[PDB]
Design a protein around this nucleic acid. Structure first.
Lengths: 278, 278
DNA sequence: TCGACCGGTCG
DNA sequence: TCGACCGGTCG
């Protein structure tokens, strides 16, 4: 569909939403809008739940576009009683973690693998079990990966730590922060995964609102892409922006950027975890 | 004076702005407002120069409060044709660099010391002369420090690099971005100074707008104070928030947080550079 | 250009 | 809690 946007009159623009019909957009909006200001529903849950829903409604759409052009722009328009943009910052980062855990845990459960979002209070013990407590940048690990009957420092249910996920909606941040603790974890035989929506579009005046992300190409890498393909500073990177350029069949480091949708069951991400941990 | 802050939509809040009169406030406003949208004037220069002006008009006022409760607020109200908050993000960081250089270079010149803000196009050579180019994270340094007849790789006038400043209006967890660069610099025998306005106030409904900063106290440290006093991640820290608690006489790392006003001639910062570089 | 600045939020 | 998320901007 053609999505029409108003940025504060008379600045108006439009952008194409591939594989999203008007009715499908309406469907997603009808689900999401009531949740945005629902009392006692954390917006990380509202957004996370709506993203899982939206990618099921539009399994052929660019998931990053659903996040950026649909959920983001609707949230900004609809959020009440608090600054929409800064609310979005605070709630959407954790929302992505929520969506990851919700989307993947039922598929991973069959394999004894479990993701846990390290919200306030969960991180310290997790980082300790990961062997990177009080290491600079370790706080950038957002989701713990555990496997029953394996891993470091198993809990009472037998789940031990086998990796961590650095979850980032977008990549403007200093990702070099992440590297030392990531390398330490990789050295311990733990998975260190960068999971991202790779969101970035440039708005009017002179931007065309196409959500191309920030990872460049193998032929012309951004510094971020160099971290993965060149330096090998993560075990793998998964981007849910269909416009993200995937790695070549081979990379200098052997580490790859993988690109995928967010709908369905077993995907490149689940099969990656399962194969790594089997 | 009592400041009246327009939070929009008929919402008003108040905060006390010590050692600023209504008349001094108007003087600052009269200088700064016409600069906010002035053609051909970068806002980093508008804000930077207005800060130097404001601290000279109100030398007993809390510099951090002048930045946060006056310049920020006026900028947000007055900026035309572009999102005020995001414009402020993009321009105010560089503005603090501008202000540091403007305020300190006259006094430092008497001792053959010179600051230079590392704006676009300048960083590559500066890092090379520092001996830290192409190291992971080393780009996160803002203002270089040079000494005539000292330092490394002297320029045409004999000024060699002796260190750098990590300049931050506010710390949040963004100061963690500076830690790997800082450790690398100190490892190469360079001065690595954290200079900050230590801005943080909690606006209603989240607090009382008092700009207490994010460094806690020696008895009750924030994680940021631990970076400095515990881990020794910087050569020294200089805060221009009069509410920042200075370090005790001794710290575990031997590194200290110093606190001062901004306007003046010689101060703890210049004394520090002169002593370190003599 | 397009990399990287900051702060209200809310848990 | 007091930590720390993200994106329009602009040089």
């Amino acid at each position: 569909m053609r999505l029409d946007l108003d940025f504060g009159r008379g600045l108006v623009a439009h952008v194409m939403l591939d594989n999203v019909s008007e009715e499908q957009y309406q469907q997603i909006s009808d689900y999401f809008v009531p949740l945005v200001n629902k009392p006692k529903l954390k917006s990380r849950d509202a957004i996370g739940q709506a993203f899982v829903m939206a990618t099921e409604v539009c399994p052929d759409a660019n998931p990053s576009d659903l996040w950026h052009h649909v959920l983001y722009r609707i949230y900004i328009r609809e959020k009440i009683g608090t600054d929409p943009s800064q609310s979005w910052v605070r709630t959407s980062g954790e929302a992505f973690e929520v969506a990851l855990v919700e989307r993947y845990n039922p598929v991973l459960a069959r394999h004894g693998i479990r993701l846990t979002a390290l919200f306030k209070g969960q991180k310290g013990l997790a980082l300790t079990r990961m062997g990177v407590a009080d290491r600079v940048g370790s706080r950038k690990v957002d989701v713990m990966i555990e496997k029953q009957g394996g891993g470091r420092s198993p809990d009472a249910e037998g789940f031990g730590v086998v990796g961590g996920i650095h979850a980032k909606v977008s990549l403007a941040e200093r990702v070099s922060d992440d590297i030392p603790a990531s390398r330490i974890m990789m050295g311990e035989g733990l998975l260190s995964v960068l999971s991202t929506l790779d969101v970035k579009s440039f708005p009017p005046p002179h931007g065309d609102l196409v959500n191309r992300g920030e990872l460049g190409t193998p032929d012309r890498p951004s510094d971020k892409r160099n971290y993965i393909e060149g330096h090998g500073d993560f075990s793998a990177c998964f981007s849910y922006n269909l416009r993200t350029s995937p790695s070549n069949a081979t990379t200098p480091s052997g580490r790859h950027i993988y690109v995928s949708g967010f709908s369905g069951q077993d995907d490149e991400f689940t099969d990656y975890l399962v194969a790594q941990l089997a």
